[PDB]
Every structure is written in structure tokens, then in C-alpha cells.
mmCIF file of C-alpha atoms in Angstrom:
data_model
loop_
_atom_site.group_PDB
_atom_site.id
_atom_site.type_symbol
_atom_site.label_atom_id
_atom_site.label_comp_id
_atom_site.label_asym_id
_atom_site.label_seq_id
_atom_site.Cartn_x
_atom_site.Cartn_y
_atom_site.Cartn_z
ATOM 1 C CA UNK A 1 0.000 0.000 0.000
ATOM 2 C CA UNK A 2 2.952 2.360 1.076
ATOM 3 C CA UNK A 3 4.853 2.140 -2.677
ATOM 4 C CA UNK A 4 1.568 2.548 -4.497
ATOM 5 C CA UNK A 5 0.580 6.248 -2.045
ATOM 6 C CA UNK A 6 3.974 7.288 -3.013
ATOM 7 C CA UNK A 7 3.751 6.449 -6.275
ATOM 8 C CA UNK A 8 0.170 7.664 -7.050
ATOM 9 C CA UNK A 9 1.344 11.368 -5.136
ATOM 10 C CA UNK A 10 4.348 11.762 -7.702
ATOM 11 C CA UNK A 11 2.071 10.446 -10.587
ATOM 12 C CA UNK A 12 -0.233 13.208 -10.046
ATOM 13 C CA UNK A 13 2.704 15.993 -9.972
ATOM 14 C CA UNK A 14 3.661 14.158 -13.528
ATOM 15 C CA UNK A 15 0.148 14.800 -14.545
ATOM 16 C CA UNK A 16 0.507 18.715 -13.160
ATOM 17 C CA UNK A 17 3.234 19.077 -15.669
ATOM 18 C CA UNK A 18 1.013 19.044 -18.378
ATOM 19 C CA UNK A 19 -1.189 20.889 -16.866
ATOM 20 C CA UNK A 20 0.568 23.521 -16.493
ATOM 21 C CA UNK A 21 1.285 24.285 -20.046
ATOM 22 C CA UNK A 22 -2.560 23.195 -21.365
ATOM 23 C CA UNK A 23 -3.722 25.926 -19.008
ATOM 24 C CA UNK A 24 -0.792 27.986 -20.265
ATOM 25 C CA UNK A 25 -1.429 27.860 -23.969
ATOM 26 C CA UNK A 26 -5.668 28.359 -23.493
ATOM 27 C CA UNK A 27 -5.307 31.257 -21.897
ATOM 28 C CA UNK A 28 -2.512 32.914 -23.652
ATOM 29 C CA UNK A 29 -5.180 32.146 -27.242
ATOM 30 C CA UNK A 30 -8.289 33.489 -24.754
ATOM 31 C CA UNK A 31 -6.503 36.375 -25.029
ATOM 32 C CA UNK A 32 -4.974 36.400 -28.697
ATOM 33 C CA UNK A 33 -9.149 36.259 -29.384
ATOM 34 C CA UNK A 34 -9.247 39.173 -27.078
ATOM 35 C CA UNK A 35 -6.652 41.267 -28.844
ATOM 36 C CA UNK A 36 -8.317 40.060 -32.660
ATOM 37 C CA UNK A 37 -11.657 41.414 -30.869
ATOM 38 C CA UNK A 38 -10.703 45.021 -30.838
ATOM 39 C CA UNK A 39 -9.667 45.842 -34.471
ATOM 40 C CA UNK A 40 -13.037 43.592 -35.777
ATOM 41 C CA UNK A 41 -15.616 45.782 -32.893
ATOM 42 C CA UNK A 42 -13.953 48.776 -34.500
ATOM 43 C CA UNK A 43 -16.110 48.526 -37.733
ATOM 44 C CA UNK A 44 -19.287 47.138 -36.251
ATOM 45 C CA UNK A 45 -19.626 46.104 -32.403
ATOM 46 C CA UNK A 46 -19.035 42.367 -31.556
ATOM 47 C CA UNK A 47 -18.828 41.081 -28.131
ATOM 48 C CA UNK A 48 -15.584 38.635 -27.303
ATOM 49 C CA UNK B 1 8.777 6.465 -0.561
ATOM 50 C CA UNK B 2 11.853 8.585 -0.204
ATOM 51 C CA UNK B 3 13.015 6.609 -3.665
ATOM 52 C CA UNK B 4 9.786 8.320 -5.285
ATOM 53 C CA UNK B 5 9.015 11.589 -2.906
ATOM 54 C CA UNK B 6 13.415 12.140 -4.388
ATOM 55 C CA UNK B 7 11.927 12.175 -7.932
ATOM 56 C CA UNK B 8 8.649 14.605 -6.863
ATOM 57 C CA UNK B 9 11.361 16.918 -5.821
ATOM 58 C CA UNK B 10 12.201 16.832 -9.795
ATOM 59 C CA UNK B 11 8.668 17.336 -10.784
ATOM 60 C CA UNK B 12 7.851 20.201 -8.281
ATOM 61 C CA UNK B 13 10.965 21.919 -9.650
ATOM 62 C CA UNK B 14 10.100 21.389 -13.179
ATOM 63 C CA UNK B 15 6.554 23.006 -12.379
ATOM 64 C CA UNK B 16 8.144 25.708 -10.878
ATOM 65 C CA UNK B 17 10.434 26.758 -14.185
ATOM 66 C CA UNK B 18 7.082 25.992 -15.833
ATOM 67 C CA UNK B 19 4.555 28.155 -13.951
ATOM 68 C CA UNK B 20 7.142 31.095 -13.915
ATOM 69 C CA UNK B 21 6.678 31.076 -17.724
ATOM 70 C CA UNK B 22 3.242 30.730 -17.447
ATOM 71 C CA UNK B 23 3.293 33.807 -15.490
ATOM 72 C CA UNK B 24 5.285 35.727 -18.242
ATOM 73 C CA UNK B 25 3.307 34.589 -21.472
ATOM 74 C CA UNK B 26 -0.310 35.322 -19.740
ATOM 75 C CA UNK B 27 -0.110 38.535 -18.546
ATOM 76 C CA UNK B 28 2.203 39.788 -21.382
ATOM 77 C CA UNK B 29 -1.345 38.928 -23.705
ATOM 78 C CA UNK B 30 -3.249 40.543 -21.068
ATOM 79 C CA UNK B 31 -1.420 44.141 -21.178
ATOM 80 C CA UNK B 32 -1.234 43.841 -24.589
ATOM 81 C CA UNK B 33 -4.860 43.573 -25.078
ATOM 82 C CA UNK B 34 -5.367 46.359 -23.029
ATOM 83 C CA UNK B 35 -2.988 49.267 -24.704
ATOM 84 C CA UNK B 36 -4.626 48.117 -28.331
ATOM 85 C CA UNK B 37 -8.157 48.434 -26.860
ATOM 86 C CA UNK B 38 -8.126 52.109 -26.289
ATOM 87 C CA UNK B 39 -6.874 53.233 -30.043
ATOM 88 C CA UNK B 40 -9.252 50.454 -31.383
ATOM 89 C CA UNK B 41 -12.796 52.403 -29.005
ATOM 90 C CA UNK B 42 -11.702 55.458 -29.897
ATOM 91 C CA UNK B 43 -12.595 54.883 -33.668
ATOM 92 C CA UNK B 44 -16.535 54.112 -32.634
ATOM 93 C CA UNK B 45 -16.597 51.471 -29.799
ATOM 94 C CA UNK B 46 -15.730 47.888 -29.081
ATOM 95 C CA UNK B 47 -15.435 45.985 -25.425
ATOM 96 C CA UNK B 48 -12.169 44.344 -24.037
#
């Protein structure tokens, strides 16, 4: 039971790797739509 | 366990390199989004 905590804690953490740069790459494109928003509500309103 | 918590040492470290860059590419989009939106309302109107 005591190998298979350990290794299930550190499994998770390998997990929160990728993670980390899914959430990092979604957000940074939220915000490419945010800055593409701008320029296109210019001409005629759109909401993001 | 000290085998496996030694390589979640690794893996927090590698999170940390990881979330610091997270840090820089998010909120780089974020102030960049918000410099372009004033220019882009001043022409008629759009939101963030």
C-alpha cells in the first residue's frame, strides 16, 4: 500500500506538468481572441 | 517512498520553471490587449 501512495502522489505531480502548459497555452489564445476582438468591434460592435 | 518523494522533488521543480513562464506569457497577452483596446474604441466602440 505504502509504494503505491507514493507512487500515485508523484504520478499526479507528472500529470501537473502538463497541466501547467494546457492551461498555459488556453489562456494565452483566450486572449490572442481578445486582442483580434478590438480591431473587428472597430467597424461594427461584436462582443468577445 | 523517499526513492519516489526524491523524484517529486524533480517534478515540483520542473513546475516551478514551468509556472514562472506561465506567469510571463499570460499577462504579457493581457497588457497587450489592453494598450490596443483604447486606439481600437476610440474609432466608434468595441469591449475588451
Amino acid at each position: 500500500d505504502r509504494s503505491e501512495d507514493a507512487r500515485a502522489n508523484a504520478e499526479l505531480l507528472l500529470k501537473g506538468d502538463e497541466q501547467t502548459h494546457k492551461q498555459r497555452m488556453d489562456i494565452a489564445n483566450i486572449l490572442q481572441s481578445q486582442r483580434q476582438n478590438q480591431p473587428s468591434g472597430s467597424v461594427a460592435e461584436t462582443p468577445q
